[PDB]
Amino acid sequence: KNADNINKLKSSIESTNEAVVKLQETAEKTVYVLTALQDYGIDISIELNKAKSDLEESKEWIRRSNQKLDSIG
Amino acid sequence: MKNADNINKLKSSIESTNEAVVKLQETAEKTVYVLTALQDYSGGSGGIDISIELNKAKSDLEESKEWIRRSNQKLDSIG
Amino acid sequence: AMKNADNINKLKSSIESTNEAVVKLQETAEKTVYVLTALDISIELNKAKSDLEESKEWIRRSNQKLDSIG
DSSP states (O other), X not given: OHHHHHXXXXXXXXXXXXXXXXXXXXXXXXXXXXXXXXXXXXXXXHHHHHHHHHXXXXXXXXXXXXXXXXXXX | OHHHHHHHHHHHHHXXXXXXXXXXXXXXXXXXXXXXXXXXXXXXXXXXXXXXXXXXXXXXXXXXXXXXXXXXXXXXXOO | OHHHHHHHHHHHHHXXXXXXXXXXXXXXXXXXXXXXXXXXXXXXXXXXXXXXXHHHHHHHHHHHHHHTXX
């Protein structure tokens, strides 16, 4: 019973991780759009760059999670 | 019952994380909506690339929403 | 027993990493909502901010549950 449930938990997180990846892709596009709509504002530029860094870190963490899940056998 | 109890706690944790993702998906939907409304209310004044990327963002979000449904469906099968 | 215990620990670490990813997304959402404001729209952005604050609370709840695993 436990072993089956551990396998189900693993699959659940894999799916959750896919949802997070697709949301990261949504965030990339929203940031692109906001950048494109800028007035060519110094402060908005700063904040958008911080968002980009946060997004890149989000990607690294999801890779970490996926790699951890891969180690379950 | 150590392992059984921890499996219950893991299930609860993922359910909470999944809901966190759902609420963030709602944030994303409102954001894309605001931006698509702005862009569509003008001409494509920002440029056609903005409309395309906003359309792609909407598809991405629909995909993200379906992946949560799949995760929740899997958790639901845990006794 | 120990094999399942180890995989439980791995599942725990994986969810912790996923939660880190979500917190990072929440931080990007914060900055985008802020920037979108600076640039009925008010209503929709207030709902977005409301959803975001709730999202933060669900991660806190998740982390609390993970912390109880020992």
